[PDB]
């Protein structure tokens, strides 16, 4: 995986030696080249993962998250270069360096063969994200949002550190490839109950679990646009990736440890979706919708059936692209009206028709319109949860009502109705902005042609 | 002070600590501690104001009481063993008295009550000596008597130090008291792994000395003793805000920094010995240390507090202070975690 | 550095050059006392180095190319706007006063550095011991607030205590009427707006607070407007002083070494001019500070340390 | 009053100084070349050649093989009268059960 680590590190002298007008173009160009190179990871096999070395390996779970991670960096550079135009040159290079460092930490988070190196990268991703939120966020509450984002995560993750070192001392290894073959069943005891909580609660915070999600409608809201893109599209998915790696070791106790948390998501996705019906802040609506979508991934990983893991990894990739595009649309209106209040700028289809078409497409992917991979992941999770217990379709189907009802309300409040009279700085859609919307939406639509690459290791 | 006299007195401080490190007789251990205290008293009274005299009086009283308890532990060892070898002690009463005396010298809780006072009362260089060099000799004596140290006492002192150094720094704005409560918490972390693996004790001591030396060197280079004067650094020297950012994120133990290195290794040695509750509660308590580190980074690096007008004069003058080993100590206190298996050199 | 503890060990004692003519002399007087020539006159009879009275751009003269910086980078304050609007809203009065105090502190550090490095005495014009006499004269006119006087007193209390007072304070008696006559003969359109009460308050804090407190810690000399015109009488009075007061007498090589290590570290000298006391006359917000700092870095010879600027033609930078 | 603060700067319109702006940069040559870099290396390179690469993956996770291999095995066991699949994955001769 060193053929992706070294170009990502060479992005640092590429941005610190570029000319002062050239640091966006060069980083965008070569991060798109790294994203083009990322497709070589699709050398996957039906039985064996692509096992590079003692340190790095990539199965069909890590591979779509790697492609999405390496694709998200140029899109974040395009999204973030407008509001940092008057920024100091060295602080601009520090911002780009934090994004590059975050990509570097993520692409060897997903390919970490051994789990304590997974933990070190998984918690190394906090520091650039924390710095981006608390340094280039816009409002006063970015500092409190950074504190919440840091301290839910560490309070979750330090028992994970203790539990992973315990697995190291007991099983002798934390290689995932070794632990595929040396995994011992985990019986019913209180020691194994807190073993399960220590192995799971960090990823429960990072998904986020409902009830532990409180960091997110601050951290996703107070961040700048590149911070919201990487938090929604990649950094929530570290929790689901780590759950799919760690629930190998947690059988068969998971079959009765999952019961509270499944409830916490199956009711919680009803609640947060309902919360999206009454959000006045558009960016907070997208944050609570991210919680609502990741609750299904939490249920699908806890019920641990093949259809559930396939729908969970499809829904993770699909939600990455969809929520990243939704935050970019919300920023494209924030760069004009300078307020995140959704009721302020109305009737924008009269003023920006092509941008309203992008709003329509991202809303339809948010509400899981078939045959998008949003609907593929949504549908496979609903199939597996119906096979889990037949009553859950109620909480699924009711969810799919409310998920429509905030997605089109977001489409109706912002784009439809009479336009606001006193707002007159509504510029036409820049080419950078429409390029950003298309570079989100067009891969999300092309993946419906060949969805088998985003369906995990057990397609 | 006469610079020759300063050199001779600092060589006498170093001579006392080295005599503690190399001697095989308990009287020379006690002599090295006496020489160390006697020579470090003028370093604390370098500026001659009543706070330095108060700090030196408090330091003298605590170290003198610890020296008397140390000599009583030595004399009870001579009772029950008839010899003087600096090794294990041959009585649990002498072991308890020596562990109490060394906890008083290190300023571990509940004998911590002198450390945030004295460090506040003295300059930054003497506070650097007190929080880095003055730990080396008692940790050497604790290194050599660990077959006799009571487990319950050393872990009680450790967790009480970690919790009290966590809660003490949350209420502070003075930087020296922040470094002092950081000292109390880190000495708790060092003594919690002493009876399990003392190589990790030496590792934690070395990484702590590097990070504390970096933070005191930054505070000397910017001439800041308070939080709110440290927050003027971005308008005076923007690189120093980056350095205090990465060093304070290291001292909280965030990966991938090197200050994550000791405590992780400490947990790596405490779970082998079937202790799971204790390093977990220690690691959760270290979030308090990380919280007031994050408070300092929000004041200094990640925001811009309002400055004054006279700062514009200081823009025309570069720093003439000898920032000794500051790039070296900054690199070592941040980017050393990929070299974590170097710790075997401390075995 | 050039001087340090090692130079003190290797024989450079400062009393080997401290001769009888190594006297720090300060000339004081009201706004048009005519003392500005007298200072130079004393400095051309005793062989002393004359420092002109530090304006806003003294630090601009000591650093860089020596040319005055634009007013947003140095000062952020106008003496002429103080003469026009003394009770201004933006607080130019106390901002000008605090900048002038920091400028006089830098000048006094330079003067002690020259005295302790060469053994040549320095004639100053209105040193830091005689700066508060303007502050009170502003405060008694309602030009500044009480909180500004509190900020000034905190800065002065933690700064002036680290220095030695001058040997000689030469005061010039010129009354308010003759001061106004010389202001009107000067013809400066801003300076002619100075009120009678402000000049009278300058004279009152001179004669009632400054000169009594310097009468213990040095030897004050006081001349009228016409007996200050004869410089040789003043130099005769200076050369026959029997110096028996002030803390210059208990100064060995160690204390003066500590003082020389102080007055060559200019950021250490200017440490407490920017104390974090948030006062609206001196507090600059983060955006203005960021903008003015990034503009100051782009000035020629100002981006790097002084020997490291190719844009002014520094060579051998890759070996320095 | 309050301190010395720069006022809120007005928002720039990129179309005023450059009505042909693509919204990347205020320098029009830098703006147009940033447009060309994004459109070429994003759409002409990663999207088109990327979808061509994904469209011709060499039997991604050996599914097609597993079809054709199954077409062997069924043809072997429709012909030899065998059942299409055993209920036991492993041979019951090579399994020791715990006795009771």
């Amino acid at each position: 995986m060193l053929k992706y680590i070294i170009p990502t590190m060479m992005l640092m002298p590429l941005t610190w030696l570029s000319k002062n007008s050239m640091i966006w173009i060069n980083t965008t160009l070569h991060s798109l080249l790294i994203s083009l190179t990322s497709l070589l990871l699709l050398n996957q096999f039906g039985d064996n993962s692509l096992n590079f070395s003692l340190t790095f390996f990539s199965d069909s779970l890590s591979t779509p998250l790697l492609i999405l991670t390496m694709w998200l960096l140029p899109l974040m550079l395009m999204a973030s270069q407008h509001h940092l135009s008057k920024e100091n040159l060295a602080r601009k290079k520090l911002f780009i360096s934090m994004l590059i460092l975050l990509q570097l930490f993520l692409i060897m988070t997903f390919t970490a063969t051994e789990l304590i190196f997974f933990y070190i990268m998984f918690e190394a991703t906090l520091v650039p994200t924390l710095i981006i939120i608390t340094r280039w966020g816009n409002q006063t509450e970015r500092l409190n949002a950074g504190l919440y984002f840091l301290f839910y995560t560490l309070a979750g993750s330090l028992p994970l550190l203790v539990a992973l070192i315990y697995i190291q001392n007991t099983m002798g290894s934390l290689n995932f490839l070794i632990l595929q073959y040396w995994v011992q069943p985990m019986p019913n005891s209180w020691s194994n109950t807190f073993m399960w909580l220590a192995c799971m609660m960090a990823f429960m915070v990072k998904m986020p679990l409902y009830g532990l999600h409180l960091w997110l409608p601050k951290a996703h809201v107070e961040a700048p646009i590149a911070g919201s893109m990487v938090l929604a599209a990649i950094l929530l998915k570290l929790g689901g990736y780590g759950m799919m790696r760690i629930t190998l070791l947690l059988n068969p106790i998971t079959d009765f440890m999952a019961y509270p948390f499944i409830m916490l998501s199956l009711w919680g996705m009803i609640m947060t979706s309902s919360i999206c019906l009454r959000q006045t802040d558009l960016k907070s609506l997208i944050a609570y919708s991210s919680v609502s979508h990741m609750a299904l991934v939490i249920v699908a990983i806890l019920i641990q059936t093949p259809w559930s893991y396939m729908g969970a990894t499809a829904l993770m990739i699909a939600h990455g692209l969809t929520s990243s595009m939704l935050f970019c649309l919300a920023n494209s209106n924030y760069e004009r009206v300078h307020s995140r209040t959704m009721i302020l700028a109305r009737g924008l289809q009269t003023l920006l028709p092509l941008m309203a078409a992008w709003w329509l497409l991202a809303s339809l992917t948010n509400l899981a319109l078939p045959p998008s991979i949003n609907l593929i992941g949504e549908l496979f999770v609903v199939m597996s949860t119906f096979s889990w217990s037949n009553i859950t379709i109620i909480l699924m189907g009711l969810n799919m009502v409310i998920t429509a009802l905030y997605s089109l309300y977001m489409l109706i409040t912002t784009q439809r109705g009479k336009h606001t009279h006193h707002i007159n700085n509504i510029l036409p859609s820049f080419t950078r902005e429409n390029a950003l919307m298309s570079l989100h939406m067009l891969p999300l639509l092309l993946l419906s042609l060949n969805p088998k690459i985003i369906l995990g290791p057990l397609y | 002070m006469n610079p020759i006299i300063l050199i001779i007195i600092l060589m006498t401080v170093m001579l006392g600590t080295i005599i503690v490190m190399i001697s095989t007789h308990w009287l020379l251990i006690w002599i090295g501690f006496e020489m160390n205290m006697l020579a470090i008293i003028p370093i604390m009274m370098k500026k001659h104001n009543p706070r330095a005299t108060e700090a030196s009086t408090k330091y003298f009283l605590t170290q003198s009481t610890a020296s008397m308890l140390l000599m009583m532990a030595i004399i009870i060892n001579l009772m029950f063993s008839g010899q003087w070898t600096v090794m294990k002690l041959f009585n649990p009463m002498a072991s308890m008295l020596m562990t109490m005396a060394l906890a008083m010298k290190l300023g571990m809780a509940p004998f911590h009550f002198w450390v945030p006072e004295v460090t506040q009362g003295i300059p930054l260089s003497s506070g650097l000596i007190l929080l880095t060099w003055q730990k080396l000799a008692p940790m050497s004596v604790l290194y050599q008597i660990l077959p006799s140290i009571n487990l319950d006492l050393i872990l009680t002192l450790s967790i009480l130090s970690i919790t009290i150094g966590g809660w003490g720094g949350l209420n502070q704005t003075q930087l020296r008291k922040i470094m002092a409560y950081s000292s109390i918490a880190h000495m708790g972390w060092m003594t919690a792994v002493l009876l399990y693996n003392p190589t990790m004790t030496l590792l934690n001591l070395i990484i702590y000395i590097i990070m504390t030396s970096t933070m005191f060197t930054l505070f000397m280079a910017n001439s800041t003793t308070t939080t709110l004067s440290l927050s003027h650094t971005w308008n005076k020297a923007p690189i120093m805000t980056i350095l205090v950012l990465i060093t304070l994120l290291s001292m909280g133990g965030l990966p991938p920094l090197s200050g994550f290195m000791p405590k992780w290794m400490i947990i790596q040695e405490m779970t082998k010995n079937d202790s799971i509750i204790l390093p977990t509660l220690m690691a959760i308590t270290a979030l308090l240390n990380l919280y007031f580190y994050m408070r300092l980074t929000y004041s200094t690096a990640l925001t811009m507090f309002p400055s004054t007008n006279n700062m514009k004069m200081k823009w025309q003058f570069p720093t003439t202070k000898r920032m000794t080993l500051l790039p070296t100590m900054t690199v070592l206190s941040t980017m050393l975690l990929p070299l974590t298996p170097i710790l075997s050199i401390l075995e | 550095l050039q001087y340090g503890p090692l130079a003190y060990i290797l024989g450079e004692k400062t009393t080997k050059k401290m001769t009888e003519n190594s006297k720090l002399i300060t000339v004081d007087g009201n706004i048009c006392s005519g003392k500005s020539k007298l200072a130079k006159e004393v400095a051309e009879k005793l062989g002393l180095k004359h420092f002109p009275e530090a304006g806003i751009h003294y630090a601009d003269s000591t650093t860089g190319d020596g040319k005055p910086l634009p007013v947003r980078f140095s000062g952020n304050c106008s003496l002429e706007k103080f003469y026009d609007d003394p009770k201004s809203n933006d607080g130019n009065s106390y901002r000008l006063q605090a900048w002038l105090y920091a400028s006089r502190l830098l000048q006094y550090a330079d003067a002690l550095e020259h005295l302790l490095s060469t053994g040549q005495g320095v004639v100053l014009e209105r040193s830091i011991y005689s700066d508060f006499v303007f502050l009170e004269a502003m405060y008694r006119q309602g030009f500044i607030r009480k909180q500004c006087v509190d900020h000034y007193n905190q800065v002065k209390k933690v700064t002036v205590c680290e220095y030695l007072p001058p040997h000689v304070v030469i005061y010039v008696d010129v009354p308010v009427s003759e001061v106004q006559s010389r202001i009107q003969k000067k013809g400066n359109p801003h300076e002619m707006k100075i009120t009678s009460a402000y000049l009278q308050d300058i004279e009152n804090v001179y004669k009632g607070t400054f000169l009594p407190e310097m009468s213990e810690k040095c030897e004050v000399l006081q001349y009228s407007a016409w007996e200050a015109e004869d410089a040789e009488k003043v130099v005769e009075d200076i050369q026959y002083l029997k110096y028996d007061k002030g803390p210059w007498l208990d100064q060995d090589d160690r204390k003066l070494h500590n003082l020389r290590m102080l007055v060559q570290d200019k950021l250490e000298v200017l440490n407490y001019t920017s104390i974090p006391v948030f006062l609206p006359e001196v507090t600059i917000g983060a955006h203005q500070s960021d903008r003015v700092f990034q503009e100051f870095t782009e000035l020629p010879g100002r981006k790097y340390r002084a020997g490291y600027n190719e844009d002014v033609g520094d060579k051998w930078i890759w070996l320095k | 009053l309050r301190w010395q603060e720069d006022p809120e700067p007005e928002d720039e319109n990129l179309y005023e100084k450059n009505p042909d702006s693509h919204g990347y940069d205020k320098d029009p040559a830098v703006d147009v070349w940033n447009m060309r870099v994004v459109f070429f290396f994003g759409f002409s390179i990663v999207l088109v050649l990327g979808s061509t690469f994904v469209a011709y993956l060499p039997d991604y996770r050996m599914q097609e093989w597993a079809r054709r291999e199954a077409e062997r095995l069924v043809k072997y066991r429709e012909a030899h009268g065998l059942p299409l699949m055993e209920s036991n994955c492993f041979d019951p001769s090579k399994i020791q059960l715990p006795e009771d």
Binding site: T140 | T173, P306 | - | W3
Partner: peptide, 19 residues
């Protein structure tokens, strides 16, 4: 519209004897 940076009210919280 520009980035929030701390005021005097934020900064005086960090300037007392204690926190």
């Amino acid at each position: 519209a520009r980035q929030w940076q701390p005021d005097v009210e934020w900064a005086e919280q960090y300037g007392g004897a204690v926190m």
